[PDB]
Symmetry: D2
Subunit: 295 residues, 4 copies
């Protein structure tokens, strides 16, 4: 037997950082969960009990904190690139670093219509994420995403004209509820290294905001023919607005809300045009994915 692939590191490293403006007194907080996995010439730790090639996972944890102390942690694409580059430059035998960062929301509170200098609310479970793969001699590959964005529209969704055979019971519909949790990923063109990532820093926050805005506006405004058709419209728009993106991937569950026939009870009408009360279904759920790239 032989080691075909190996990686190891530290997962679930929670990090908080505060920035304090001495002039204005305003404080800004960042909170993330970080995972770093390393690859390189480490097979002998597996096959020969040779620990000399192991950068201890505990040391990786220390490094994340030190790096956060000495560098900006925003945008996460930059922080991830700095963190990954550190490992491949510092250790001769480490040739790839894989950094995943989940950013948690701490939104500044408005108290009596004015922004508070040091108080924050977790205003959503929505996350902003990055995956950064730093590979020696091959540059920096970055996938940015948003996830956990939960939305619902109560009308202006349709689903008709699908395949019908002996396995089909679903009725065609011209008016249904559509609800989903959005997971959207945009993949950046490969960067040559840190200098290039730094050159594009302003684009990271702007592209996240664009992806979010396009997702929300398209969801709200599209008279949806299917989840498939609506998600494609979202992806097309994002690719149009940022040329440094190579692909956009969406993964959308279809979180079903079922009509409840109450006609058995005093002829109560609660279906079709009369539907007011519905049963949200926890499971099963449709799951629709697509990756959109350039012609």
């Amino acid at each position: 037997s032989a080691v075909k692939a190996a990686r190891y590191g530290k997962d679930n490293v929670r990090v908080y950082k505060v920035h304090k403006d001495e002039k204005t007194g305003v404080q800004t907080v960042y909170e993330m969960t970080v995972c770093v996995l390393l690859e390189g010439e480490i097979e002998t730790s597996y096959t020969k009990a040779d620990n000399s090639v192991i950068v201890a996972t505990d040391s990786i944890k220390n490094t994340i904190y030190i790096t956060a102390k000495q560098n900006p942690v925003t945008p996460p694409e930059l922080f991830g690139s700095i963190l990954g580059t550190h490992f491949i430059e510092k250790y001769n035998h480490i040739h790839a670093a894989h950094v995943n960062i989940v950013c948690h929301r701490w939104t500044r509170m408005d108290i009596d219509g004015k922004p508070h200098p040091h108080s924050f609310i977790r205003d959503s479970e929505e996350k902003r994420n990055v995956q950064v793969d730093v590979v020696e001699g091959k540059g920096i590959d970055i996938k940015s995403s948003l996830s956990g964005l939960t939305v619902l529209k109560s009308t202006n969704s349709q689903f008709w004209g699908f395949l019908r055979d002996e396995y089909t019971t679903l009725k065609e519909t011209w008016d249904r509820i559509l609800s989903t949790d959005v997971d959207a990923t945009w993949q950046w063109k490969n960067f040559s290294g840190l200098q290039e990532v730094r050159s594009h820093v302003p684009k990271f926050d702007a592209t996240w905001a664009t992806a979010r805005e396009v997702t929300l506006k398209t969801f709200a405004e599209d008279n949806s023919a299917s989840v498939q058709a609506t998600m494609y419209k979202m992806a097309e728009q994002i690719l149009a607005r940022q040329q440094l993106i190579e692909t956009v991937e969406y993964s959308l569950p279809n979180k079903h809300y079922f009509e409840i026939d109450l006609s058995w009870h005093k002829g109560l009408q609660n279906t079709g045009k009369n539907a007011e009360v519905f049963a949200p279904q926890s499971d099963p759920n449709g799951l629709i994915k697509c990756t959109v790239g350039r012609s």
Copy 2:
């Protein structure tokens, strides 16, 4: 042996309701999870296998949907009171109904600065809840709450002057992070029945809003001496603003964020006045509770 207490019913009943304004085209959605447990002369179902006294839990589920079809589901204090009263009036041998409702957030989307007629976002995991106990001959007892409101302030929290003995290692501090998940409950004066609950309908939403506003403003503005002192200030204010409330209860975890000493690494300064990077602690956590009533 004897049955000392018994209750039974249906839990985890998910309900969605839509209101459609025909004039304006605006739609409004409500989503809840409902639990109803009944008590009464039902001991023989336990001791003698006498199912004749059992209103089937499946029938309770049907009743929740029917009641939602035929009545307002907002404010939840009203819906809960209607639902509970139904069971005690309809069934001679059922003498108490216990209704718990969790309301989920579906906040209207703003698209290009204007409110969208039929699109919504789950803008937080914060819940608004009610517990309604409807007891035959004893009226309606209602406890309203908010829960899952997660906040953090990065300064203006202190904790010093606590008891010090041979079990104490905690250092006194004049500047720390304070973060919590707020669970706040206000207990209404007993109502005589549905007519009285209906008479006070406008007070329910207003009191929820007040409790939320007081919680946020007090958290943000108090230079906190302890979680204990800050939460008391919140409760005092709520009781002052709504005379129909008898008690306010808060249950607050103290979600710790620890300093990280980095001095071992090149004399890096990251404690006290120099603290920028912290380690959020998943567990353990302080847990502070208090119930405040009138003199």
Copy 3:
């Protein structure tokens, strides 16, 4: 306003302890999650920012570890009683301690048919719990429980003869699936203090084992008329076998498995006597409770 009730302490304190037999080389592990909440003359910490009355929650955490170092942690009824008594004896102004312990399963591995001296498996998510309330001048109240015991029987469950009215759609049945997660609590007679708890130490593990054995055998063997009737049989037996128990409480969800009518597809028969494939329902669920005491 006035403080009507207050308690505070540390929750989610994870503790592991190992016992090493020097003679045999056998090791035994215990893992628990502990919560301790205190009450006493502490109102001024809330109303006056008087921290002098506060035993810091951090100190409570330290105390749990120290107490685990210096005492047996099994049975948990004993450990909880020791821990609670410590706080009321040590601090003049603390008058009640509320200790909750969740015990996690670490079951010794069998390797090649023999018990391994130091390797363990989490063989179930089932917990053994205690709630110990130690109140100055009022002794020690202990509630022992098991929870998270998930079982299913595929036949020998019935449900017929329930109330039928205009809210009822449920069909009577003489053969259904019954599945539940068992939560069973037995309440001990009040103990005068630690000496008395110590006097009964052997009864704690024995009564837990009896409660578990009775629950499993009754579930498996009863041709169940309802969840209500089966759970009463369990409680009756436990009370018969341990005279120091005052009450037994069961809380059982009815985790529904629905028939799937497949007759629309080539006349496939999958209902009644022909039912083979079912749809487990995540929600809603029945919830049945009862507290059984002595005549």
Copy 4:
């Protein structure tokens, strides 16, 4: 823009099946959660709102139930292969089916030392899983796994001789706790189609049992030099015992248990040889992966 990749289907389909032996009266239950995602000539559903190419996700759900009614659901490798093959054969334009199955434990109860004919316990949260990819013209690729197997050993784990630099604080150790949740995957050689999968049916359960047995015995008996070294030993053995396996992958968290220094309290000794009470750490955790194949 163009569709680069697309797949869609139904996730979280819960399925239960019962087998009833008419001769012996013994019943056997199976419970699974199934996901099926399809690929093929479906791009126009995304780009042109052409639903004619969509096999509705609801129909996929129906198909899972029908297929479970008409076929064995064990071993899951077989059921998954049948289910996947159905979609590629039935629909001309569907060219790949991706089937994921999670099998839940329902272990027959022993009552008074004898196996009960129709009562079961969820004796662990451990799962047995399969991923089956059925691709038209390319056969059937099967990855079998176990996951959620949680183990702990209290001694006979070491970790010393790792890299030490200015980022390192971890002390070398010759005696520590090792605890992990095992995720182990074995990848079968490609099968040409259903006939070949059927030919190997007995090997599936046997290989699962072997993988489990090897994992447990190796964990218990290895005087572990590192997680890396121990996991390699496991993988090597599995590959030796089943020639139809091409690779074995392990993913193991290192769930840390920290010593607690209590020396500040009355010189209490609880470190090194005196360590009895430890603090289990919820996060962060080491994460160690490896894929082992043949020379």
